[PDB]
Structure 1
Amino acid sequence: KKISGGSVVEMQGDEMTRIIWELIKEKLIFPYVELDLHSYDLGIENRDATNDQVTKDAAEAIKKHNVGVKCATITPDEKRVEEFKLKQMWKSPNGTIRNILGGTVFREAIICKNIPRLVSGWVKPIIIGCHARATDFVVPGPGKVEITYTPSDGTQKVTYLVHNFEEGGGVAMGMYNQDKSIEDFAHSSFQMALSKGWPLYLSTKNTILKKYDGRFKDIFQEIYDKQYKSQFEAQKIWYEHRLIDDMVAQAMKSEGGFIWACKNVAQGYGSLGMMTSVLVCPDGKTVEAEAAHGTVTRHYRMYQKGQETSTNPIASIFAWTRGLAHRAKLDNNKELAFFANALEEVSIETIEAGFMTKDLAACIKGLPNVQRSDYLNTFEFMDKLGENLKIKLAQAK
C-alpha cells in the first residue's frame, strides 16, 4: 500500500523543530510513504560525538541519493558551547552542506489566501534565489590602493586604481566570483525555474557596476540560449534580465509566480515559519530542502516544562513536499508527487479553512490581538493535517 519514494536522505534536526520533525514524520510521512531514509543526526548532540564527520557524510548522501531534506539545526554560538558543553564550535551545517554541494538556495514563503502579505495582490509566491567571500582592509593612512590582477603564467600585469587616499584614511574591500560559481548560480537558477515552470528574472545592477554585474547578465543570457532556450519556449517559461528597480518595480506590479535571482539570507516580509527554503545543484538533480526559519528558541523555552506552545510547522512540511515532489520527477513516480502535491494544499487548506496556528492568527488582528481561541497550538495541528489529507486522499486514492 505504502508509496515508493526510494532513497530520500534526511537530516535529524534540533530543539523544538526536531519533534515537529518527528511529529511530521510520525504523522504525515511514515503511515503513507515508504522510503529509503538514511537519516543522519545533525544534532549538535551528535556533533560532540563523531567530530563533525557525519555532516560531510550527510552531504555525500544527497550527492548520491540526489535528495536530502533538513530539519532546523542549531549553529554553535556563544550560548551553545557553554550550555551544551561543546568540544568546539562546529561549522554551520547550512554552509557545511552548501559549500560541499555548491548549489543555490531558493527561499519562498507559501501563499495562504487568507493571511496578510507585503502585497495583497500576490497570488503565487516569488521564489527569491540569491548568490549570497571578500577581503576587506582599513588602509589606515593616505596611500593609493590598487587591485592588480597578476596572471599565473607571467603574462602582463593588470593594474587598477581603486582610489588614492589623501585627507584622512580610507577603507576598501576585494570581491570576486568565478564562472564556475556563476554558472553554478546559473544552471541552478534555470533548473529551479524549470521545475517550478515559472518565469525566471535575473537582476543585477548593470549600469551601476558594468563589467562585474554585466558578466552575470552575460552568463545567463549565454546559457538561456545555448542550453535552456528550447525547454523554455516549450512550457512558455522565459528568462528576462531586468535592473534591480526595473525588477522591483514589477515585483508588486506583478502578482508572482516567477523565480527571482538576486546578486548582492532571510529578508522578505513573510513570517519565518511561512517561508520554505530549497537548495539545488546546477545538475538539476541533488535537491536539499529545508525549513527557512530558525530552530525556534521560543516555544522551546516553553517546551521543557510542559506548557502549551503554538508553532507553525508548515515550512518543515514543505521541506518534505519539495523533497518528495523533486523526488518523484527524478524517479518518475507519479504517485509520490501526487502525495506531495496534495499535501501542500492539505497544509494550505487547513489555514484556508481559517484554522491556523498562532503566528498566522497573531498576524491577522495584530500581535497582542492573538488569543488561544483564535488559533490552535502546535501538537494539535499535526492532527488536522493527516485528517484533511487522508480524506483528500480518500476520494483521490
Structure 2
Amino acid sequence: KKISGGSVVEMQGDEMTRIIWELIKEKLIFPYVELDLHSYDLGIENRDATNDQVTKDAAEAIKKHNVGVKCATITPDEKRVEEFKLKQMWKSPNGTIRNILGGTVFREAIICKNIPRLVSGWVKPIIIGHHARATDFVVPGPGKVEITYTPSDGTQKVTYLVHNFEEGGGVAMGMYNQDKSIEDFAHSSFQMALSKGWPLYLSTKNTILKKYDGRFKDIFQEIYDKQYWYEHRLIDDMVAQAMKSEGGFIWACKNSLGMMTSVLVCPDGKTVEAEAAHGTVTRHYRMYQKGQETSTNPIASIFAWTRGLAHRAKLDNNKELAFFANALEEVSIETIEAGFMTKDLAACIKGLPNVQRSDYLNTFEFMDKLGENLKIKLAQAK
C-alpha cells in the first residue's frame, strides 16, 4: 500500500520548526511513505540531558545511512543558557555535523511565479555552493614577518616577505588550501550539476589572489576534462551574468527565509544532509505559546524532506519514492501559485502594511491545504 522508503536519518529540532516538522511528518510523509527511520532528538533539552552525545550519534548515523533530514535547532548563547539552565554553551549542532561529514553546502531559494524575486528575470533557481585552517598570531613589535616554503626533497627554499613591521606591532596569519579540498569542491559542484541537469559557473577574485584563486580555476578545468557544461568567470563579471538569464545554474563561489533550502553534499557522492536554511522562528513560537495564531512557512522544511527522499530514491533506484518526492515539491509550488500561502509570502506580494487576513493561511490551514492537494495529486497519478 504505502511506499517502502528505506533508511532515512531524521533529526528533530526546536521551537516553531519542531511544530512544523511534526505536521509535515503526520500530514505529508507518514500517510504515504513507510521508513526505516533513524530518529535523533536534537531539541535543546535533549542535547543538554545527553551532554550533546545525541548530536554526535546523529552525525555518525548520517555517515552510515547516507541520508540526513534535519529540523532547525537552537544554537545556545548566554540568554539560552539562562532560559534552559544549560550545563554549558553547547556548540551549534550544524557545526558538529558538518565537521564529522565534510562536504560542500548548496543553498537554493524555491521559486514561485507569483512571488517576487531579486531579479524579475529569474524563472529557474540559482544554486550557490561554497566549500565547507589558519594560523594567526600577534606581532608584538617591529620586525619581519615572512612565509616560507621548503619542498620535502630539500632542493629549494622559497621565502616571501609578508611585511616588515617598522613602526610598531600588529597581527599576521598564514592560510593554506590542499589540492584535495579544491578537488572535493569541484567534484560536488559537477555532481550537483548532472543531477540537476544545469550548467556550472565558478567565480574567483583571480585578479587579486592570482595564485590562490588561480589554483581553484585550474583544478576545476582539469576535473571537467578528465572525469566530466562548465565555465569560469570573475566575481564582477559573474554578478552581471546573474542580473540577466532565466537562472537555472550551479554557481560555485570561492570567497523570504521560509523559501531558502540547504543541502550538504559529501565528496563521496553518496552522503547528503538536507535542511531549511532558516532558524527555529522563535518569534512565531512565542506567539504560539501565548495562544496567538501563527503563519509559519513550512516550504524550506518540506524541501529538506523531499531532497532527502529524492537522494534515498536515487541510491536505492526506488521509482515510487522518486515520484513521491517530486510530486510533493510540485504540490508545494502549485499551492502557492494558486494563491494559497502563509503571511510572509502575502507580505512579499502586497507589502506588510497592505496584508489582510484574507490574503493568507495560518500555519495549520496552509499544511491542511498542502495535504488536500497532495492527496489529489497522488490519487490522479495512480
Q: TM-score, normalised by structure 2?
A: 0.96
Alpha-carbon shift at residue 124 of structure 1 (Å): 0.8
- Shift in Å at residue 341 of structure 1? 0.5
Task: Tell me how many residue pairs correspond in the alignment.
Answer: 382
Report the alpha carbon displacement of residue 190 of structure 1 after superposing the two structures with TM: 1.6
In structure 2, the gaps of 5 or more residues are none
TM-superposed deviation, 1:157: 4.0
SS of residue matched to 2:25? helix
Q: Distance in 2 between matches of 1:371 and 1:147?
A: 62
Contact 2:103 2:132 in 1 (8 A): no
Tell me, yes or no, if the aligned pair for 1:189 and 1:282 is still in contact at 8 Å: no
The SS at the match of 1:150 is: strand
Deviation at 1:194, TM superposition (A): 2.1
> 2 CA distance for matches of 1:88 and 1:375?
41
CA 324–141 in structure 1, closer or farther in 2 if over 3 Å, else same: same
What displacement does 1:80 show? 1.1
CA deviations 1:327-349 (Å, max 9, x no partner) are 11111111111111011111001
Q: Which has the higher strand share?
A: 2
1:166 CA displacement: 3.0
Find the aligned partners of 2:41 and 2:277 in 1 and give their Cα distance.
Answer: 19
Q: What is the alpha-carbon distance in structure 1 between the residues aligned to residue 363 and residue 311 of structure 2?
A: 27
Structure 1 unpaired stretches of 5+: 229-237, 265-270
Distance 1:319 1:337 in 2: 14
For residues 296 and 118 of structure 1, the distance between their equivalents in structure 2, rounded to whole angstroms, comes to 23
In 2, are the aligned partners of 1:139 and 1:172 still within 8 Å (CA)? Answer: yes
Q: Alpha carbons of 1:167 and 1:379: their partners in 2 closer, same or farther (altered >3 Å)?
A: same
- Distance 1:317-1:171 versus aligned 2 partners, 3 A rule: same
Query: Could you tell me which residue of structure 1 aligns to residue 139 of structure 2?
Result: 139
CA distance in 2, matches of 1:376, 1:156: 69
Instruction: Give the Å deviation of 1:256.
Output: 0.8
Q: Shift of the alpha carbon at 1:134?
A: 3.0
Distance in 2 separating the partners of 1:217 and 1:211 = 10
Aligned equivalents of 2:269, 2:121: Cα separation in 1: 31
Q: What per-residue deviation string (whole Å, max 9, x for no partner) do you get for residues 70-125 of structure 1?
A: 01011111111111111112221111111111011100100111011101110111
Q: Which moved more, 1:113-122 or 1:243-252?
A: 243-252
SS of the counterpart of 1:175? strand
Worse-superposed segment, 373-382 or 165-174: 165-174
- Distance (Å, rounded) in 2 between the aligned partners of 1:79 and 1:357: 30
Q: Give a deviation string over 1:307-344, Cα, whole Å, max 9, x none.
A: 10111010000001101111111111111111110111
Secondary structure at the aligned position of 2:127 is classed as strand
Q: CA deviation at 1:65?
A: 1.1
- The residue that corresponds to 2:3 in the other structure is 3
User: Greater shift after overlay, 68-77 or 163-172?
Assistant: 163-172
Partner of 1:233: none
Instruction: Indicate the larger mover: 166-175 or 287-296.
Output: 166-175
Question: 1:57 maps to which residue?
Answer: 57
CA drift of 1:170 comes to 4.2
- 2:313 matched to 1:322? no
User: How big is the shift at 1:169?
Assistant: 4.5
Deviation at 1:141, TM superposition (A): 3.8
In structure 2, the CA distance between the partners of 1:156 and 1:43, relative to structure 1 (3 Å rule), is: farther
Deviation at 1:220, TM superposition (A): 1.3
Query: Using a 3 Å threshold, how does the CA distance of structure 1 residues 48 and 287 change in structure 2: closer, same or farther?
Result: same
- Percent identity at matched positions? 100
Task: Give the Å deviation of 1:218.
Answer: 1.4
State how far apart, in whole Å, the 1-side matches of 2:21 and 2:112 are: 22
Change (3 A) 1:151 1:81: farther
User: Which stretch of the first structure deviates more once superposed, 47-56 or 338-347?
Assistant: 47-56
Tell me the CA shift for residue 173 of structure 1: 3.1
**Deviation of 1:387 (Å):** 0.5
Distance, in Å, in 2 between the alignment partners of 1:310 and 1:135 is 46
